[PDB]
Symmetry: C7
Subunit: 180 residues, 7 copies
């Protein structure tokens, strides 16, 4: 980032948030803070969230997600480059009707990844958790896309890569931008 | 973090503290300092503490906890994303009636983790300590939630994960926010 | 990066010039896209110049830049200075047709995508199928930008293909080889 | 931390010093510098030193200690979270009558830790030193607490963990907070 | 570096660029940017490029080189301390007649270094490349020095170290400064 | 290091106070010497105070400080706060005779030089000869500063020698033990 | 390095350059830049270069050296603490008559260090180079000191450590200071 004053900061002035990295507790905390701030400046005006991320932590993602739905402003999402795992999720969380993607953008969805370690009990505790998480997310996706849960389930069994059009068709995005 | 003033700093101007990392001596020291500062600016106005943390050091946590109860202002807590171990604890420490959580927030509670090393004596010294710590915390939770000690004890024997509603039911939060203002 | 005259790269951005002099990854892409978006907001009418000296990078990170370039109103002129390979070469070719330059000793290299699979037969197939489409997708874009028929681009990028400024001009990657600015 | 003026710095403006880390030559040097600075701004006004530290170097600690007793201002200490080894020591060094601690604060005291390496002679040189150090410190504690040396000696043979009340009873703190004002 | 407002920056104010490190994509990018900037401030005034470098990437070097020949201003070069590989090259790229070097400066030239790895084909692809690179550079040197290609070729077979005078004689520099 | 107007240590320098609270190496010496030189340029008349809490350091780095102290016009007062060993102790003793203080529980340790040789017999001899002279050189300086006869300093620094504030006062390292700042 | 404006920078304002580290391409580049800058501000006024360095790269050194002789201003050198290898060299490069050193300063000179690796040819290429370098430097030293080349050669065969006086006698410095101003 070129200190022209942060570049990303000047862009925030026009109500634009840039997510171009993996999603972890830290990134989430920043983006959530940006969202909260924008909502305080003008809870009326729209917000744009560009997304080019490989995914990240399930919780960190939901923090962003909920924050988006929580604030008054409508958050428009634009998948630029690539949006997978939570990244894809967040793209779909954008205000229905304002979820865009560029021509060669790419989108990928899949079931949750995790790990258990310890006693049988402990592992069960973790397996039960992740499974609910999977179920919780799939349901959210169903609403955002329109696909029936059954589909989302079978479709995210393994890495599912989709093109912008394929993404439009599935119900992840609403339109493919070409000129600004 | 952006500089459009430090972002987290501008948010502090509206009396909002952001905890989005593990809790250690350092983080505790920062948040306590923020709380103390806010209390000096206007000991009358409310304070909001967003929480998305995996937990941390028992002592570092209590430092925050006590500081919250100590200052005049009422600290409102909002679990955003995830609050476990001390994180969950702090969420519950928020002014009764103003402890919120978002729809897909998640909350986990459990007994303390630690380690002993050395002579039998030394290990006993540590085992006796941690056990009291566990007991001390559990009692605090009982008050904050309303659950009887017995329950908190049995319920935190091993990692206990709860949804926002499950959290509301247990007495950790008071309401699940969905719309702002 | 010398502090004053404040980032030098920043002062250069003031004259609407973006410098890409490193590999291309999610991070770099994010910065450059941000610069492009910013410039388009300042004056969607004026031209933009993107100097390029990069070894290539992530396919996605690249397309992000690519699409952003085609997306914004301003016309993005590209100048291969030193070296432009993989996505780097690609981006050079994405510059507004007619304003894609390269200096005398610039060098340009193109090739098919690199990647890796790991896991069950299924998983590997999933990856092989993906990369292959990616290759195909990119090759098509190149055909348009260069004028070469897909067939050529395919056979020509089977293995690292190094080209000189002239060879690059001939292939249709650049339009002119700059020599001075008086 | 957050820059809204560094936060720890703004807090120093109200004459408050934050010790929330282990104590080493470096930390000591910073805190001593802060103390000296505050004494130059107004040698009349009180100073507050919040403490949440695991302890540290015996010398680094004494530097702070002496500096506290040296300057004109009276240094009030507040154990927030946890104060052990030198940390505990410093808490006890606070101006008698103004050594506080919050509800769930925790305090631990113990004899010195060290190491020798080399020739018999060299080890003896080190053993003789540390032993005097132990003795020197114990005496200081006796004065600050009121306990007779005999007690301090036997009581710090091995890690001794105390609760806020237990700490009040021993004579380490004077009062336990709860509500500011 | 110390503040004067950076020191290397204040020196840039008098139109002086300092190259005192190896040459890599990054360094090249910085220096090229400095050159472009200076050319925008006053395409009429001269520019001075002090050089004390062990060499670097062939491409990173050429980027600098071409940029020097490309801009309107004349770039004067001064080898201070040591200039080898590309470093030497850049010294020779300075505006003919204004390529200086201090008394105990030292200059070294040599053929390109690189590496191949993989299938016979792949290695051939790399060998063919580097060889052309060598040839390309040698030709550039011939022009800048005046030496016939034949000489440059045989002379750079292995590390060739030259003193300021030896450098003057070869045609790399034009004069050895004593006290400006 | 809390920046507040501005870095704590800097504001303290404004009142002519230098803080040495770390080991002594080429770097630290360079900073402290620079501070001393600066203070001497601001007012070569006014006194300077050098607080010391250091484990010691490089013999040369130390002497650099030492000489600089004796070199400048201002009189440098030293205060051992916490601990002063090896060069640290040395520097404390270098303070203007009469203004070398120490707090109640300060501690001071002195000892002969530490080093290492490596290589040919010759090379090792070169190093052994050097360090020995260094030891001798320093001991002499200490004799003057303390008042103790060389013989004593020699025998007394054969192995780590730890001294209390009083023991330090008695030896002649400090002049008075402070109790009030005033 | 305390920000008063930075100490080293304020010192540069009075035309003083501080070299207190090993000498490498980077340090050389900085010091050269400082020298060039000072020469632009007032090519008439003298410049002082304090030196406390263990030595460094032969080329990095020469860059400084030549730059010193190149600029109009006369560069006065002061060995403070220690000056070895190139460091010693630079001390000797100071304007004859203004090369000082403090009482306990120390100065060490020696022949060049390096390394070869590869084919016989390659090694010869390097051996031939370093040898010329040694010869080149020795000659410079002869001029600066007054000693005949033969002496410098034999005298730097192996690490040669000299005291301030020994340094004065050899012709490296001109006077040993003892009172500034």
């Amino acid at each position: 980032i070129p200190t022209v004053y942060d570049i990303y900061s000047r862009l925030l002035k026009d109500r634009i948030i840039m997510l171009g990295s993996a999603i972890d507790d830290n990134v989430a905390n920043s983006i959530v803070s940006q969202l909260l701030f924008l909502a305080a400046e003008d809870p009326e005006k729209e917000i744009s969230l560009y997304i080019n991320s490989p995914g990240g932590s399930i919780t960190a993602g939901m923090a962003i997600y909920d924050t988006m739905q929580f604030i008054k402003p409508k958050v428009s999402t634009i998948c630029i480059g690539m949006a997978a795992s939570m990244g894809a999720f967040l793209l779909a969380a954008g205000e229905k009707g304002k979820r865009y993607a560029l021509p060669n953008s790419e989108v990928m969805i899949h079931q949750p990844l995790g790990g258990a370690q310890g006693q049988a009990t402990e592992i069960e505790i973790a397996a039960k958790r992740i499974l609910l998480l999977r179920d919780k997310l799939n349901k959210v996706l169903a609403e955002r896309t329109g696909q029936p849960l059954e589909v989302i389930e079978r479709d995210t069994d393994r890495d599912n890569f989709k093109s912008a059009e394929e993404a439009l068709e599935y119900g992840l995005i609403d339109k493919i931008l070409t000129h600004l």
